[PDB]
């Protein structure tokens, strides 16, 4: 016996341990496929590509052709390619690698590249130091400033981040604009942390009479010009949010601790309750629901929750969301499914 167990039981446990020690290879191989432009090469080929044609296009040295084959077979087994064998081995796209093809409705390749930046993803080697920090975020530990300040000083990172945020924007924004219950009766809305206006443009295109303010950090909105009913305001959501009939928070609250979310939600409440008005706040973020979601979906949401250590953020379940809303002085809330992993939450002051 080994470790008080049958050798066969130990071998099974060793296999599990190795799967996890080496899990980073799943990430790194996927990154490599995107960096080598393989999904687009195959799409452009118009049929499954032979290994010989693939390496010919890539112009890899002959000494590394077998390494390409090994990586392709590894990716295929993970579900990113289909191997078809005739005279030669060939590689076809799958639905998952079709998500990496430029100029698709949903092209998520920019998310792969942003998340797997060596410095950002490398930050996760410092979970131990981070867990001992009373206040710092994981990125605060590794980058030497807060994340938003870091983006302001590093334009290539700012671009990578913006592209990653844009990569699922059409789908979410279109699902949002199709929610008439959100926009019925509004005369104005402020998109708090609204970025470069990606969401707001779709809103304005849908509802040409609606006043829309894109609100974000001064550096984010500097030099952007609005049109007719769309304007940009630079500011700090922790200090003052412009008055409107409604606030939108898309992918905002999951970036912050409960304490910081409280501060934001207080400013949002103020924005929608000026001069006797009683507006509302509309939130787009994940809602964890272990009882109702499919297990695989719950698992991804739990993973994202762990990933949010980067900003001391959180992916919240309904009880967690409710506790925030009550502490922030909102009277009631409603949660609806929106698209994929995301819900639409409305709160009423």
Ligand X SMILES: Nc1ncnc2c1ncn2[C@@H]1O[C@H](CSCC[C@H](N)C(=O)O)[C@@H](O)[C@H]1O
The dihedrals phi and psi of 185, each to the nearest 5 degrees, come to: 85, -15
Question: Residues 46 to 105: which contact ligand X by CB under 6 A?
Answer: none
Question: Residues 139 to 178: which contact ligand T3A by CB under 6 A?
Answer: 146-149
Give me the least distance between CB of 194 and a second copy, in Å please. Answer: 24
Single residue of 251, 321, 325, 333 touching ligand X by CB under 6 A: 251
Overall residue count recorded for the chain in this entry: 349
> Is 168 assigned a ligand-binding role in the annotation?
no
Query: Tokens 């279109």 correspond to what residue?
Result: 174
46 vs 144 by CB, closer to ligand T3A:
144
Give the long-range contacts of residues 101-106, CB within 8 A, separation 24 or more.
101/39, 101/40, 101/43, 102/40, 105/170, 105/171, 106/167, 106/168, 106/170, 106/171
C-alpha dihedral (130, 343, 207, 279), degrees to nearest 10: -80
134: DSSP letter: S
Q: Is 254 a catalytic residue?
A: yes
Single residue of 49, 55, 116, 220 touching ligand X by CB under 6 A: 220
Question: Residues 86 to 105: which contact a second copy by CB under 8 A?
Answer: 94-96, 98-100, 104-105
Say if strands 188-192 and 230-234 run parallel, antiparallel, or are unpaired.
unpaired
Q: Is 37 left (phi over 0), alpha (psi -120 to 50) or beta?
A: left
Question: Residues 152 to 171: which contact a second copy by CB under 8 A?
Answer: 171
Answer yes or no: are the C-beta atoms of 254 and 313 closer than 8 Å.
yes
Distance (Å, whole) CA 112 – CA 77: 19
- 147's contact among ligand X, a second copy, ligand T3A, none, with CB below 5 to 8 A by partner kind, is ligand T3A
- 146's contact among a second copy, ligand T3A, ligand X, none, with CB below 5 to 8 A by partner kind, is ligand T3A
| 29 near a second copy (CB under 8 A) | yes
280 vs 314 by CB, closer to a second copy:
314
Site size with ligand T3A, rule: CB under 6 A: 6
| 274 near a second copy (CB under 8 A) | no
| 148 near ligand X (CB under 6 A) | yes
CA atoms within 13 A on the CB side of 5: 9
Question: Residues 234 to 273: which contact ligand T3A by CB under 6 A?
Answer: 236, 238
Give me the least distance between CB of 128 and ligand T3A, in Å please. Answer: 21
Q: Concatenated DSSP letters for 214-279? A: EEE-HHHHTT---BTTEEEEE--TTT-----SEEEEES-GGGS-HHHHHHHHHHHHHHTSGGG---
Q: Return residues touching ligand T3A (CB under 6 A).
A: 146-149, 236, 238
Q: Return residues touching ligand X (CB under 6 A).
A: 148, 165, 193-195, 198, 216-217, 220, 236-238, 250-252, 255
Instruction: Give me the active site residues, please.
Output: 254
């Amino acid at each position: 016996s080994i470790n008080g167990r049958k050798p066969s039981e130990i071998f099974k446990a060793q296999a599990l341990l190795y799967k996890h020690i080496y899990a980073f290879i799943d990430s790194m191989s996927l990154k490599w496929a995107v960096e080598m432009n393989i999904p687009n090469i195959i799409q452009n080929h118009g049929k499954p590509i032979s290994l010989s044609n693939l390496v010919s296009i890539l112009q890899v040295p002959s000494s590394k052709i077998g390494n390409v084959r090994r990586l392709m077979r590894y990716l295929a087994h993970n579900g990113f390619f289909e191997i078809i064998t005739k005279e030669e081995e060939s590689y076809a796209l799958t639905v998952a690698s079709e998500l990496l093809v430029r100029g698709s409705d949903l092209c998520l390749a920019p998310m792969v590249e942003c998340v797997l930046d060596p410095t950002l993803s490398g930050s996760y080697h410092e979970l131990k130091k981070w867990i001992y920090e009373e206040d710092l975020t994981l990125f605060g530990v590794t980058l030497g400033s807060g994340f938003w300040d870091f983006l302001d000083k590093n334009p290539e990172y700012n671009t990578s981040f913006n592209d990653a945020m844009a990569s699922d924007s059409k789908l979410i924004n279109l699902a949002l604009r199709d929610c008439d219950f959100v926009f019925d009766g509004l005369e104005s809305i402020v998109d708090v942390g609204g970025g470069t206006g990606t969401t707001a443009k779709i809103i304005c295109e849908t509802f040409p009479k609606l006043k829309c303010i894109v609100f974000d950090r001064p550096q984010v909105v500097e030099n952007l010009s609005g049109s007719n009913n769309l304007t940009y305001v630079g500011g700090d959501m922790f200090t003052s949010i412009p008055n409107a009939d409604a606030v939108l928070l898309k992918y905002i609250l999951h970036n912050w601790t409960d304490k910081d979310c409280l501060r934001i939600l207080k400013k949002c409440k103020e924005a929608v309750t000026n001069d006797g008005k009683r507006g509302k706040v509309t939130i787009i973020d994940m809602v964890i629901d272990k009882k109702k979601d499919e297990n695989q979906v719950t698992q991804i949401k739990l993973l994202m929750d762990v990933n949010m250590a980067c900003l001391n953020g959180k992916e919240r379940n309904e009880e967690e969301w409710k506790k925030l809303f009550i502490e922030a002085g909102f009277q009631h809330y409603k949660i609806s499914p929106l698209t994929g992993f995301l819900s639409l939450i409305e709160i009423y002051p």
